[PDB]
Amino acid sequence: LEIRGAGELLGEEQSGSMETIGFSLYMELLENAVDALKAGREPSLEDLTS
Amino acid sequence: EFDAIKIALASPDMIRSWSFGEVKKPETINYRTFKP
Numbered sequence: 508l509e510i511r512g513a514g515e516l517l518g519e520e521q522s523g524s525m526e527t528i529g530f531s532l533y534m535e536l537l538e539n540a541v542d543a544l545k546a547g548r549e550p551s552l553e554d555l556t557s
Numbered sequence: 558e559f560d561a562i563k564i565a566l567a568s569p570d571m572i573r574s575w576s577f578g579e580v581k582k583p584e585t586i587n588y589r590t591f592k593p
Binding site for chain 1: 587
């Protein structure tokens with residue numbers, strides 16, 4: 508780490524020096540997703556892949 | 558306005574007195590938005 512740089516947090520591709528979304532924004536997205544999921548009866552994405 | 562200039566060491570209490578907060582993250586600008 509800090510030789511190759513941590514890859515993009517919300518994507519694939521570990522170990523990349525990219526300038527993608529930061530940790531502060533990621534936590535915000537996660538809690539927003541938690542609220543919008545726990546709100547109205549909304550089934551999982553991959554579950555409706557069933 | 559004043560008579561003299563005083564120079565001394567900086568006590569950590571004085572450094573916290575100067576401060577208006579604590580910096581925690583090493584990123585400056587979002588660079589997509591130009592906001593801090």
